[PDB]
Amino acid sequence: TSIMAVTFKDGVILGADSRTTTGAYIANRVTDKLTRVHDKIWCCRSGSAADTQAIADIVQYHLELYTSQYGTPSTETAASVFKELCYENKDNLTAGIIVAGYDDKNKGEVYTIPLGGSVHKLPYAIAGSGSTFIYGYCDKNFRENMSKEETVDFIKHSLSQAIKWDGSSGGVIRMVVLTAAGVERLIFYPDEYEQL
Amino acid sequence: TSIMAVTFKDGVILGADSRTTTGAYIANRVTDKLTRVHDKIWCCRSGSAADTQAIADIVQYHLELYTSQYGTPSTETAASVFKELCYENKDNLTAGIIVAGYDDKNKGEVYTIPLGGSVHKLPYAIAGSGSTFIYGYCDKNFRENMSKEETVDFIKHSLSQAIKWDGSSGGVIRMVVLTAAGVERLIFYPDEYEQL
Amino acid sequence: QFNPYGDNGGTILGIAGEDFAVLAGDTRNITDYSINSRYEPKVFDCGDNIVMSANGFAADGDALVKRFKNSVKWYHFDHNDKKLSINSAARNIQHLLYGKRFFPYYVHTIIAGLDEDGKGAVYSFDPVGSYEREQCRAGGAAASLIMPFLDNQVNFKNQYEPGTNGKVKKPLKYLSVEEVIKLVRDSFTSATERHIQVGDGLEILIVTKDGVRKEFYELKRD
Amino acid sequence: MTDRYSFSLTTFSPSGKLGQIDYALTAVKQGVTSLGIKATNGVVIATEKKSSSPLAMSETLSKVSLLTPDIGAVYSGMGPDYRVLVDKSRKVAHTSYKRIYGEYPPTKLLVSEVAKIMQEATQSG
Amino acid sequence: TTIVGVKFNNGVVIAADTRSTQGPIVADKNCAKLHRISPKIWCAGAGTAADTEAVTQLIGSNIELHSLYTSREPRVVSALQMLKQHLFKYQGHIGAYLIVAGVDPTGSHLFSIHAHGSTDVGYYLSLGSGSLAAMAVLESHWKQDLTKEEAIKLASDAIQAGIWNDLGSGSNVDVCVMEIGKDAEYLRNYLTPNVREEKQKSYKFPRGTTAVLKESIVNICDIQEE
Amino acid sequence: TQQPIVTGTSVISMKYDNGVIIAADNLGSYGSLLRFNGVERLIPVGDNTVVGISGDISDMQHIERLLKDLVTENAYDNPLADAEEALEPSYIFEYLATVMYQRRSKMNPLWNAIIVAGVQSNGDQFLRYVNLLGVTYSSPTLATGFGAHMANPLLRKVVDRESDIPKTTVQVAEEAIVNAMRVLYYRDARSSRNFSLAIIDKNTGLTFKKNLQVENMKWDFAKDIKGYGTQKI
Amino acid sequence: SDPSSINGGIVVAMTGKDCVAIACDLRLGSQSLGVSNKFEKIFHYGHVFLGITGLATDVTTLNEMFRYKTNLYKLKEERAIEPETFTQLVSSSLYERRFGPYFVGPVVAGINSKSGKPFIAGFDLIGCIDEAKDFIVSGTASDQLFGMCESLYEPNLEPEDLFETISQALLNAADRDALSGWGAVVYIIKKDEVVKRYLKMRQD
Amino acid sequence: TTTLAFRFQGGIIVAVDSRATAGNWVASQTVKKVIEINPFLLGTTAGGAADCQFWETWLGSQCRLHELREKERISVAAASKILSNLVYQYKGAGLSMGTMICGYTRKEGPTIYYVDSDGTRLKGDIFCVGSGQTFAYGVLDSNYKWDLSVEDALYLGKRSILAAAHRDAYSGGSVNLYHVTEDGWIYHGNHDVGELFWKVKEEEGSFNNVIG
Amino acid sequence: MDIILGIRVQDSVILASSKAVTRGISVLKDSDDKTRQLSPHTLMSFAGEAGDTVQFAEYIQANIQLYSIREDYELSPQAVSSFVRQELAKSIRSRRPYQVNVLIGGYDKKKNKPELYQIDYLGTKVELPYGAHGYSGFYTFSLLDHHYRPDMTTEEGLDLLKLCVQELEKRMPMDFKGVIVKIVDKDGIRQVDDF
Amino acid sequence: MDIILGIRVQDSVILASSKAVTRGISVLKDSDDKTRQLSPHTLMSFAGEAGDTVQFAEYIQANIQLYSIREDYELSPQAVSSFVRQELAKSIRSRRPYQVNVLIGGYDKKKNKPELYQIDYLGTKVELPYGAHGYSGFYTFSLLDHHYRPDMTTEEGLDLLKLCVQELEKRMPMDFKGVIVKIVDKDGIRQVDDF
Ligand SMILES: [Mg+2]
Ligand SMILES: [Mg+2]
Ligand SMILES: [Mg+2]
Ligand SMILES: [Mg+2]
Ligand SMILES: [Mg+2]
């Protein structure tokens, strides 16, 4: 798996590959690892698919009940609910989740939650088996307050390299754009990103 | 450990960090991992220090005896002797060696020899624990027939990132330049490469 | 795997006199080959003229001492400020220790004081609560270095009266508090020389009818 | 190949003489004079440095050799045979004594070891 | 064990503590850890004590024979090469961890050797259980172009850090100074900061205290004449 | 029973004449990966206490929340919450020490080594240690992990016993701490150049210094070092 | 299971003024079972004395080995071996079995016949020499012996005083060890006379 | 450890050694392996020292509550069964106990029950428990008779512990003797094995192998 | 095998050895003689692992018989016991050690003295007035310690031996099917056919 | 414990049970009665793990005695055996199972027939003419298969039982110290005091 979330001027963009493997067999080559817990709060999932789906579903339930009572939750609140589940059940979970969301007050925010259940607010985050190969590239190429087109290129180029080297990653590059304008899904196929 | 060798227009340059660890303790922070087996055939060492020193010393002996009888050996010949030792003794060795050399006929050549004892001739090679973090960066930034100054910058920037993310790597960035002009040693300190 | 136990080193020594009692212990606290503290008190005044030390794993040691001090406090509440006698304290500590029979306090406990007749008393416990009144007891790391010396110099074991040649034993004459303290100091000086975990400082608590008194002595810091 | 000379080249003649030993002694007789004198507080050994050529540096050719810090040797006869005996004598002082007892061998025992090596070349194949 | 090596202006110095241990028990309180490979090539050993002693005597023996054979004074690189190839052959089973230092016609040298056969070059080095305490001192006070007096001070201070802070090290400080164009000076018990205080009591027994069953004269002499 | 995932390395500290100093680098490692470079591992409680934490970071964040919650709880029905009945270092430590030992006794520890540094109401210096086993101890100098092996020896040269504390100034103490942090950066493979330092003085109060860097490093001698034995070039 | 503590037993050696002393218990056992109360652990080759603790078969084997070697030494050297030389021989002999060692704790004691200097030495199972001035200890109650010796010992004791010190060191150490005791022997060694004394002790 | 107890004409003899070891290290030579449950009942300690001390002291409390409720001395059968039923609840948890519950009542006469941490409960005439039990059994079996006098029976129990104390490395220190009668137990002193061995050797002529 | 005892009296050595041979579940034989005559005045009993016991005993027997022929002379019991010890001491560091414990009972014709030697599989030799191997000593030594005298007659030794066997038959869980008893004295070796 | 046998003849059931109790290295008792009377005409012998055996047997005894008082009626051997089986079948899936094997010998007063039931620790019940537990059957069943007849007298049954015990005493390695024999018939339960 290769997943990342990047903040930029207008908000935040989540990016992910689509490969799910059982050993060396690709069980699903068109997986959707970008999942929605609220209207403008999404997450990237890595680790146990069963665990991360179970967690995400519980979070979506919590934020839905939150919204009914207290109105729209912050991205920080969503990250806290993820953390609470991951931290308290650390012995029985294998989940690496990146939380990304757009407020109007706070704008684009990114939180990463690694295995332990800790929380780290970052300008951008990378995770999954394929992320190891692009720590150098992402650190050198990331800038704050990029444009939408620049951020899409940054994520596309980053995940392209992660896919190139990581056998556990592959397929299409999915992306979800979170801004004041709304929610935009993007997809990029092998013939496009491999030649980069 | 973070090591690499890069061919360019005038020849080849070997690069390496200087950190040697025993667990989390840095046993030597000024290690020289760039070692000479012949006048213009050097190697980068990763893995067991005892194994790679023992191997290198045997190779140096073989190439010295080769030179006495048959004149200057090719870089390919040096790589073959490394391979023979690593392949035949694969059960008792933990060695990852990059071989780099300069002929006048063949110019700059780079051969990598991973754990198994296989040989791979490449335009450039990266290896060691820190190499994982710069596969993306190096693939995006490498060009063939670079100048000396460009290749030095490429290696410096690459190993800078490897050092930044890999705890097993660090210290100074050592480099050795192999050209028709001769053999030039370079060193770059933390205050220089960290700010890149 | 998580290992809930550890070894904090240290050595303790309890000696019962005729009308007094001493409980001594070094002040060094360690893990593996490192020194945590050169002065970390190990022998404690628990009230009611009782002194205590729980040597071994310091976290369990501190927990037990804390719980016993608490037991003394509640004994006063429940029984009209009655003085907890050393024999009653000993039986109480057995139950505290045996209470964790299947997850023991990893310590070797010693208490000292005076019995109800005013005579010197020392009690020795194993980790799970088996106990016994004793005249002389070293505990901890250098216990094997100290006890044979005490058998010889306190109880006069293997010592016979010159001229008789093995026929008449050396008589068991009573030792003064000054004489005991000399043997305690020499025991710890010798233990410091030959045991790496012993050193830094020696703290002795002396119990008499007048109360509890403290004495401190330097030990080699290597 | 293989050393197929597994038999003795020194043998008793009808008269009871060991020819090759006698002939070796004859070679020693032709050799340059060397001597030794023992004093109460020391011993001296001496010989002539017969230079084969004036262009040769006779300092490089050492006829008198240190065997141990307290033992020295000089010879008469064939120089090359001496040189290899010194090498063997130095090594045997370590392997069969110093590495066992942690000290250098006494003169008589080192002599005994050198003698043994020379005896074996008189009987071996 | 705490052992260090420090380069200086015209040579090199090595130092060591004097405590040898059997688990938590101190076997010898004044152990000699500075070993001689050759007159001007000395080394200090940590790890398995028999292996360090045995491997230095063996290489020291072969170095002597080599020196006689070549009519040259022994070199540190030769000791280094012979040690590492021997240790590598035995794949770490010979538990010898050494700091090798010395002077020869090539100059002054300082190397460390690990049990598996790996070697390192440096201006300052430390080995043993107190190596971290010693290396802390070395990293705090080392500089280029040290004098002989400064290097002895630094080396002994590094050993002291091990003596006081490492339980595996203690007692005294041994030092050996190897300067170029000079005899190496072995300074046994250079510092003595751990003398035992006078005991409170004498434990000399009255004669006849021990009970005896039988007495006899043992015949240590040879078989006699007549 | 767990295993630590994201970890923090050495915390070092010492007493001086008027108070205590404590320091810790800003790194959150992920095994050999130097993952997070902006992690604050010194957490102040009030204006008189700083809790330095090493080990598992997720457990550190949990402990951080307990201390934040402790301050809130202390203020409840407490008119003297910012005066006589404010939280002392000794109260904060004993609370943590209780939790740590309870958690180890349930075979589910907080995988940390903690140093509580502060100054009491009466001006007394407070410096005490506690870890995942619930083991506690106090000393003029305290350090966790690698700090115990490399920092303590250096800090003990300044304050070797109790009587050296009044003789040690804040400038000398800070100098020793900063040097120790440099030594750890040279020699600890799980350390970073960036660190935080906190001083708690009985007169000048709590001084919290962020974004400090290891400087005045010696590396030049590395150029002369060649090969691993025989190599000259 | 542990070869060095199957049979049990102890040896201690001390230096005095112009004299040395070496002593041992007499027990041989099979773990808990007492088998022999006459198993002496001290031997001598000329004027050099050797105590050996540990696995009893190896104690016997090494004694036979050093008798063998010191006998050949004497024939070739035309003189009895000295303590300093014998110590190196013991060390060499143990280390040649580096990866298959004798499970023993040898102790050398004796006076150099030429210099008159008292000498003691100890070894680990693998040959490492411990050359202490004061005392050497070995066996299953070595901790106890270290404690006794460290407190009881003082330098330059006369032969008849040294006897009392080493005897009390041995006896009281053995009484705190289950696998030691069942009798004891003490050798008092001077330059040209040696006295051997059997001690009376508890037999449990 | 060596502990024994046997029934005879005059009641019960109980005899134990006094040594306590942690591996080869002799922790104590003055350990009490007879628990005085009450003035009429005795128990021996082998295996776990704490387990035997704690639960036999507890047994005394149960026996006291019995005779308060029932206004009658508890039987040895009932007393032993309280202990065996208790340890049987803990079976598997790792209790280590090997004991003889000894008593003399009207209805039963002199009675000995061997009780075990495996839940075993055996009535018998002669029992030996501990690392040196086999040595004590030999002396007992060859010399035991029902019509022994109280003097001779006491000596037999003493001599049997001495036999074990000599041979068994984990037994020794001193011998504690008890004589159990219907009116209660009677303590017959602490006897140092060191002094006892030489005394017995001379007077009896035994242990000729040992030099004295 | 199981139980082997030995007792040295005034003028002879008596060896008692069990007759049972068990192979796991069943007792295959109840009349097995666990001993070999090494020389006219030297007898060796043995117990240990199956096969190794007899293989070792017969190997020793052959070697002593070879020595007897070569020199036309009977080795002393001490000399034989030292030879046996060395073989076992050699064996313990071998690829596959002999798992054999032995008692060597002999009468020294030179010294006119009976001698009993106990040697275990490690090569641990001891000269004793009485001895055993395995668990046999645990039951019998307390009786031997009590009753034994160095001036005992052969008949008294046999009575003390009967008492030892009776204690074994009472307290041992295993049925060793009684013992074969042999006496070694100045006249040689003979078997007590009724015991 | 070790060996327990059972044989159902014409008009009675005979149970033979060993007397030995061995706790490790020593035989602590040689007169142990490994049986309990459940009701006047029903006897249960038992063998298995220490403690569990007697605890189980006495628990069953108490329950059958309780039933006898409540109903003033003796349960049939079949009914008792089914109750016992269920307890063992319940036990095998427990936290800590009873490790106990039993034989239930009873005389049914209604049917005027002897009955022998064999139940192992798993709750495996079988009604048999003759039975055993552990290794006892391996030695004895071939003799019982050969000689047994359903119309045997009690005296003939005892003779066949003696032959079985003799074969056990010959070929078993363990000394089980003989057997206590009890007979269950129309008149109740009695012990054969000489065997
Ligand atoms: Mg780094
Ligand atoms: Mg290797
Ligand atoms: Mg003893
Ligand atoms: Mg004993
Ligand atoms: Mg034996």
| H155 Cβ contact list (under 8 Å, min separation 6) | none
Q: For residue F126, what are its two tokens?
A: 């407070």
- Ligand closest to CA B165: 1
In whole angstroms, what is the distance from residue H59 CA to residue I76 CA?
63
What is the domain extent for residue E155?
1-226
Give the distance (Å) from ligand 1 centre to CA of residue F11. 18
Cβ-contact B26, B35 below 8 angstroms: no
User: Which chains touch A (3+ CB pairs under 8 A)?
Assistant: B, F
Question: Which residue, among I112, I116, I138, I147, has the nearest Cα to I129 in the 3D structure?
Answer: I116
Q: Is H79 helix (H, G, I), strand (E, B) or coil?
A: helix
Please give the C-alpha separations between residue J109 and each of J10, J12, J69, J185, in angstroms, as whole numbers: 14, 11, 18, 9
Count of CB pairs separated by less than 8 Å, A with F? 31
In whole angstroms, what is the distance from residue A126 CA to residue H119 CA?
62
Residue D82 DSSP class: H
| G4 Cβ contact list (under 8 Å, min separation 6) | G53, G54, G55, G103, G104, G105, G125, G140
In whole angstroms, what is the distance from residue G85 CA to residue D105 CA?
11
- Cβ pair I145:H166 closer than 8 A: yes
Q: What phi and psi, each to the nearest 5 degrees, are found at residue F100? A: -60, -45
Fold entry, domain I1-195: Glutamine Phosphoribosylpyrophosphate, subunit 1, domain 1 (3.60.20)
In whole angstroms, what is the distance from residue B79 CA to residue B42 CA?
10
Cβ-contact G182, G34 below 8 angstroms: yes
Q: For residue C60, what are its two tokens?
A: 């369990």
- Ligand closest to CA G36: 5
Instruction: Give, to the nearest 10 degrees, the angle between helix E49-70 and helix E76-89.
Output: 130
In whole angstroms, what is the distance from residue G86 CA to residue A60 CA?
83
F17: left (phi over 0), alpha (psi -120 to 50) or beta: alpha
Q: For residue B10, what are its two tokens?
A: 């005038």
Give the total residue count for chain D. 125
Name every chain D residue with its beta carbon within 8 A of the beta carbon of G75: none
Options 3.40.640.10, 3.60.20.10, 3.20.20.240, 3.40.1160.10; which CATH number does C1-222 get? 3.60.20.10
- I66-73's contacts with Cβ under 8 Å and 24+ in sequence apart are I68/I39
In whole angstroms, what is the distance from residue E181 CA to residue E9 CA?
13
Instruction: Give, to the nearest 10 degrees, the angle between helix C177-194 and helix G142-152.
Output: 120
Name the minimum distance, in Å, from the CA of G32 to any CA of chain E. Answer: 25
Options 1.10.10.10, 3.40.50.300, 3.10.310.30, 3.60.20.10; which CATH number does A1-196 get? 3.60.20.10
Q: Tell me the sheet residues that pair with H55.
A: none
Q: Tell me the sheet residues that pair with A6.
A: A13, A124
Name the minimum distance, in Å, from the CA of H177 to any CA of chain I. Answer: 20
In whole angstroms, what is the distance from residue J115 CA to residue J128 CA?
8
**Domain count of chain E?**
1
Rg (CA), chain A: 16
Instruction: Give, to the nearest 10 degrees, the angle between helix H133-143 and helix I136-147.
Output: 50
Q: What number of CA atoms fall less than 13 Å from residue I176's CA on the CB side?
A: 25
Question: Which residue, among E102, E108, E97, has the nearest Cα to E79 in the 3D structure?
Answer: E102
Residue with token string 């893990």: C31
Give the distance (Å) from ligand 3 centre to CA of residue E186. 46
Q: Is F151 helix (H, G, I), strand (E, B) or coil?
A: helix
In whole angstroms, what is the distance from residue E135 CA to residue E5 CA?
10
User: Which chains touch C (3+ CB pairs under 8 A)?
Assistant: E, F, G, H
Q: Method used for this model?
A: X-ray
In whole angstroms, what is the distance from residue B31 CA to residue B20 CA?
7
Question: Which residue, among H55, H74, H66, H165, has the nearest Cα to H116 in the 3D structure?
Answer: H55
Interface of A with F in 79-98 (CB under 8 A): 87, 90-91
Q: Do chains C and H touch (3 or more CB pairs under 8 A)?
A: yes
G200 touches chain D (CB under 8 A): no
Which among D57, D94, D97 is the top mutation candidate for probing chain E, defined by the most E β-carbons within 10 Å of its own β-carbon? D94
The answer regarding whether domain F1-233 maps to CATH 3.60.20.10 reads yes
CB atoms within 10 A of CB J5: 25
Cβ-contact C12, C27 below 8 angstroms: no
Q: Which residues of D touch G (CB under 8 A)?
A: 99-103, 106, 109, 112
Name the minimum distance, in Å, from the CA of H26 to any CA of chain E. Answer: 18
Q: Is I7 helix (H, G, I), strand (E, B) or coil?
A: strand
In whole angstroms, what is the distance from residue D12 CA to residue F231 CA?
58
- Ligand closest to CA B54: 2
- Cβ pair G33:I138 closer than 8 A: yes
Instruction: Give, to the nearest 10 degrees, the angle between helix D79-93 and helix E49-70.
Output: 170
Detail the DSSP E strand segments found in chain G: 10-16, 19-25, 28-30, 33-36, 42-45, 48-54, 104-111, 118-123, 129-130, 135-139, 184-190, 193-199
Is the C-alpha dihedral spanning E129, E131, E132, E134 positive or negative? positive
In whole angstroms, what is the distance from residue J82 CA to residue J77 CA?
9
Q: Do chains G and B touch (3 or more CB pairs under 8 A)?
A: no
Read off the amino acid at residue J166.
Q
> What CATH number belongs to H1-212?
3.60.20.10
B165 closest CB neighbour out of A135, A162, A164: A135
In whole angstroms, what is the distance from residue I119 CA to residue I85 CA?
7
H134 closest CB neighbour out of J26, J32, J49: J26
Name every chain F residue with its beta carbon within 8 A of the beta carbon of A120: 28, 36, 39
What does the domain layout of chain B look like in residue ranges? 1-196
Q: Which H or E run contains J182?
A: strand J179-185
Ligand-binding annotation for H163, yes or no, is: no
DSSP F124-144: -EEEEEEETT--EEE-SEEE-
Residue with token string 């064939």: D78
Name the minimum distance, in Å, from the CA of D87 to any CA of chain E. Answer: 7
Active site positions of H, annotated? 1
- Ligand closest to CA F190: 1
In whole angstroms, what is the distance from residue G9 CA to residue G59 CA?
11
In whole angstroms, what is the distance from residue C150 CA to residue C12 CA?
13
Please give the C-alpha separations between residue I3 and each of C107, E139, H135, H141, in angstroms, as whole numbers: 44, 69, 16, 20
| C141 Cβ contact list (under 8 Å, min separation 6) | C9, C10, C11, C195, C197, C198, E24
Cβ-contact C121, C19 below 8 angstroms: no
Cβ-contact J2, I173 below 8 angstroms: no
Pairing of strands E3-8, D71-73: unpaired
In whole angstroms, what is the distance from residue I43 CA to residue I33 CA?
12
In whole angstroms, what is the distance from residue E155 CA to residue E110 CA?
13
Q: Which H or E run contains H49?
A: helix H49-70
- Cβ pair D94:E58 closer than 8 A: no
Q: Is B49 helix (H, G, I), strand (E, B) or coil?
A: helix
Cβ-contact C141, E24 below 8 angstroms: yes
Q: For residue C167, what is the nearest residue in chain E, using CA coordinates?
A: E211
Name every chain H residue with its beta carbon within 8 A of the beta carbon of I137: 167
Residue D7 DSSP class: S
Cβ-contact C202, C41 below 8 angstroms: no
Buried b (16+ CB within 10 A) or exposed e, E25-40: bbbbbbbbbbbbbbeb
Residue with token string 């798992």: I99
The three-state (H, E, C) secondary structure of I92-130, written as one string: CCCCCCCCEEEEEEEEECCCCEEEEEEECCCCCEEECCE
- Cβ pair I173:J174 closer than 8 A: yes
Give the distance (Å) from ligand 1 centre to CA of residue F129. 28
Q: For residue I141, what is the nearest residue in chain H, using CA coordinates?
A: H135
Q: Is F29 helix (H, G, I), strand (E, B) or coil?
A: strand
J62 touches chain H (CB under 8 A): no
In whole angstroms, what is the distance from residue J118 CA to residue J5 CA?
10
Name every chain B residue with its beta carbon within 8 A of the beta carbon of A138: 136
Q: What phi and psi, each to the nearest 5 degrees, are found at residue C183? A: -65, -35
CB atoms within 10 A of CB H175: 25
CB atoms within 10 A of CB C174: 8
I24: left (phi over 0), alpha (psi -120 to 50) or beta: left
In whole angstroms, what is the distance from residue F78 CA to residue J116 CA?
81
Give the distance (Å) from ligand 5 centre to CA of residue I6. 12
Name the minimum distance, in Å, from the CA of H119 to any CA of chain J. Answer: 4
In whole angstroms, what is the distance from residue A61 CA to residue A63 CA?
6
Residue D95 DSSP class: I
In whole angstroms, what is the distance from residue G69 CA to residue E70 CA?
35
In whole angstroms, what is the distance from residue H192 CA to residue H189 CA?
10
Residue J73 DSSP class: S
CB atoms within 10 A of CB G198: 17
DSSP chain E: --EEEEEETTEEEEEEE--EEETTEEEESS---EEEEETTEEEEEEESHHHHHHHHHHHHHHHHHHHHHHTS---HHHHHHHHHHHHHHTTT-S-EEEEEEEEETTEEEEEEE-TTS-EEE-SEEEESTTHHHHHHHHHHH--SS--HHHHHHHHHHHHHHHHHHBTT--S-EEEEEEETTS--EEEEEEE---PPPPPSS--PPPTT-S-EEEEEEE--S-PPP-
Q: Tell me the sheet residues that pair with D39.
A: none
E53 touches chain D (CB under 8 A): no
| D24 Cβ contact list (under 8 Å, min separation 6) | D77
Question: Which residue, among F46, F54, F39, F49, has the nearest Cα to F211 in the 3D structure?
Answer: F39
Which among E33, E172, E196, E220 is the top mutation candidate for probing chain G, defined by the most G β-carbons within 10 Å of its own β-carbon? E220
Q: For residue E213, what is the nearest residue in chain H, using CA coordinates?
A: H212
Q: For residue H87, what is the nearest residue in chain J, using CA coordinates?
A: J51
In whole angstroms, what is the distance from residue B33 CA to residue B36 CA?
10
For the beta sheet containing J4-8, the strands, ordered from the edge strand earlier in sequence to the opposite edge, are J130-132, J4-8, J12-18, J179-185, J188-192
| C173 Cβ contact list (under 8 Å, min separation 6) | none
Q: Which H or E run contains J97?
A: none
Give the total residue count for chain E. 226
Q: For residue G89, what is the nearest residue in chain D, using CA coordinates?
A: D101
In whole angstroms, what is the distance from residue A123 CA to residue A12 CA?
9
Stated in angstroms to one decimal place, the resolution of this structure is: 2.7
In whole angstroms, what is the distance from residue E17 CA to residue E30 CA?
8
Q: Tell me the sheet residues that pair with H109.
A: H105
CB atoms within 10 A of CB C112: 31
| H83 Cβ contact list (under 8 Å, min separation 6) | H55, H56, H59, H99, H101, H115
J60: left (phi over 0), alpha (psi -120 to 50) or beta: alpha
Q: What phi and psi, each to the nearest 5 degrees, are found at residue F98? A: -60, -50
Domains for chain G: give ranges and CATH numbers.
1-204 (3.60.20.10)
Q: For residue J101, what are its two tokens?
A: 């094997």
Q: For residue C127, what is the nearest residue in chain H, using CA coordinates?
A: H50
Question: Which residue, among F78, F85, F92, F82, has the nearest Cα to F45 in the 3D structure?
Answer: F92
